[PDB]
């Protein structure tokens, strides 16, 4: 098995490199649904995850996995067309070996979108979730995505999150909403990471509530320690497809199709707000 | 490794019809010490887990291990004699298959007990729980059943777990308990998925009750959520051994000498219970 | 992989017999920094665990690793120097075996510090606490020490943990305290099982207080369930580095350089106390 270590991570960023003259200090990761941006990266270069070394394989699950490198906003980027999931099956290294890849060719900054049900009262179906902290159920249960020797060229053995999702970066983000008239669909609040792949059970979301969370979903904690250990500041946004306690308080489910609704209706406006994060962030 | 996939099944069910001319459209999955009804199943067939195409390896545990086919009121039914946990080690796929295999020779519900303990202070020592709901704490931890690739012949990549536990059965075990007078046995509650093989401490018991959880075991959900993927309703009944809380207010104990006396006392009742539940089942 | 059976137990047990002439009754394991006991038995032996058939490969993590048998306060001792903690991955039987060589060598009592991060309102930087109970996340999540067949020579299928941290010894540590003038330093809580190696994060912190933790750590939980297992008496003491509810509140961070300066402000305080323990223990 292939561990996500400085050699291997270098012999990628390599081919990544030879490829493409494009040197980028920011990352995306775009939710299900949510990845129209990528299609619109300039003077862009397409690199299937297959044909790089030391990438994960992802024939098993099949559906898109391409590394894109461009300019967006005058800006240089790199973005993941294809997030690999940890109830995919994917071990702890295969995870963590794109996001170490982004930080050996320059990534200081990390944006990640998501889809997710809404917890907190205060949500709605269609509202944007700035993240402000988490809860790592994996993590907390010998599941953390450092389990593991530690890889000391990239970080410490134990870190601290404290300062994971960046206060700065959550401000931007809210003030270009304000600047458009749409920041009464922007709220904040805390991820709690469901493995999956089954949704929350109705008791589940009720437990959730009990425990402080605001939001539930299947992704995006694994990326954000990977990035936080080796120095990446991290944006993070949920979509709200659902909210759950309702659903639970009336008998009324969720499924993969009303998700997929729901990204298509916000997909265009979520496009032009990233499009102007990437082109304010600060020099 | 044996994967619990389309195929795999389809080798296993193949060599079980040849053995036996049994069409069941009822499965059943019993407790430790629930097991008797196995035993009065009529013109019924036993047939080794060990001499099927890609069953689980037991012999590790050993115990026993065999499927049985045959009728019951009228009706025909599976049953699996000696139940597969997953604190004994055993993969996700090792757990999927043998359900797997029952939807492929017909089986549309499945009925299940256990012996769990209690945490809501109404329940008492030989009560009965008709489960209406779960929290799954393997599941949130990214130790889920379904974890791995999906296997879409059987379900969808993301199920809804709301309806797993079917209304209309809770509601005719119900009344069969009301026809011959033993309902004042005859709750219903919230599972907890303890993963196990300790029983939960008593601060773990303190914590579940916050939580809203009714009783704890170490069984069942796994079995539920891969029926519910693949359109199988259900009902699971917990016998309960003690109340944990209690327990950890006087500073005494369980242990699995006591599990099984409780199993003892309420088994030909269980037995009684459960033939009158298949033979009502709707056509 | 090598299983912590009987058979592989009792040939690392013969090895360690035949070069040491000690037989032990007692058993230490140190937290990190507070191992300063361990460079003072008395007409020891030390054994790298490289040397010892059967004992765990730990070079990818490196650092010291012994084995150490000799004598404190004129009773047998036997402790291990260096620590294997399940966030590094670490499987079940790794942990476990050099638990069970302790049991074939003859220990009764094992003796075990750690650093951890303080929950509870009245816990602050080096403070001491009489581990109580505990809250195993990982156990609950199917990630349990005890998850694999039973090795039923050591232990039953299903241990019973209401008794896992013995009151007396508790006492007996108290009372040393009083004798010397620091009891104020001295609490007794619960203590929750973070897997790791992230430290919890703010948001975690505030849940864990919802649910009744007085502490929080990544260790200690997994051999105390091992030696429970097998019929060893055990007294946990966590050294408290910081309060993480008050960090959480002013939006300050723990670190592992701040860890290892409270754990060398407390070390000869607690080289004392436990030299003093060891002595008093009952015949
Ligand atoms: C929409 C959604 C996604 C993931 C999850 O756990 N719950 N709800
Ligand atoms: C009787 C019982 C069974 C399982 C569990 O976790 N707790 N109590
Ligand atoms: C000092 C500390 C250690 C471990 C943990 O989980 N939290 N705080």
Redesign the interface.
């Given at each position: 098995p292939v561990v996500a270590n400085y050699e291997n991570a270098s012999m990628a960023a390599d081919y990544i490199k030879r490829v493409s003259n494009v040197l980028p200090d920011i990352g995306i990761i775009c939710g299900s649904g949510l990845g129209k941006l990528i299609e619109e990266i300039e003077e862009r270069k397409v690199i299937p995850y297959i044909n790089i070394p030391n990438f994960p394989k992802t024939t098993?699950?099949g559906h898109v996995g391409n590394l894109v490198l461009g300019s967006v906003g005058g800006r240089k980027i790199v973005a993941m067309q294809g997030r690999l999931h940890?109830?995919?099956?994917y071990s702890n290294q295969e995870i963590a070996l794109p996001i170490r890849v982004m930080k050996l060719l320059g990534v200081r900054v990390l944006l990640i979108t998501n889809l997710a049900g809404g917890i907190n009262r205060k949500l709605k179906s269609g509202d944007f979730v700035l993240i402000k902290?988490?809860?790592?159920?994996?993590?907390?249960?010998?599941?953390?995505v450092?389990?593991?020797?530690?890889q000391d060229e990239f970080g410490?053995?134990?870190?601290?999150?404290?300062?994971?999702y960046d206060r700065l970066l959550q401000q931007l983000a809210l003030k270009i909403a304000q600047e458009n008239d749409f920041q009464d669909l922007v709220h904040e609040g805390?991820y709690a990471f469901?493995?999956?792949?089954?949704?929350?059970?109705?008791?589940?979301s009720?437990?959730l509530l009990?425990?402080?969370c605001d939001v539930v979903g299947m992704s995006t904690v694994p990326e954000v320690?990977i990035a936080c250990h080796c120095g990446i500041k991290v944006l993070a946004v949920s979509l709200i497809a659902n909210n759950s306690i309702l659903?639970?308080e009336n008998?009324?489910?969720?499924?993969?199709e009303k998700v997929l609704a729901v990204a298509e209706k916000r997909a265009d406006l979520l496009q032009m707000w990233f499009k102007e994060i990437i082109t304010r962030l600060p020099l």
């Open positions: 098993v699950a940890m109830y995919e099956g902290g988490h809860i790592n159920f994996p993590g907390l249960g010998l599941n953390n450092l389990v593991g020797p530690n410490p053995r134990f870190p601290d999150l404290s300062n994971a805390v469901n493995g999956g792949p089954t949704y929350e059970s109705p008791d589940e009720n437990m009990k425990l402080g320690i659903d639970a008998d009324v489910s969720i499924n993969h």
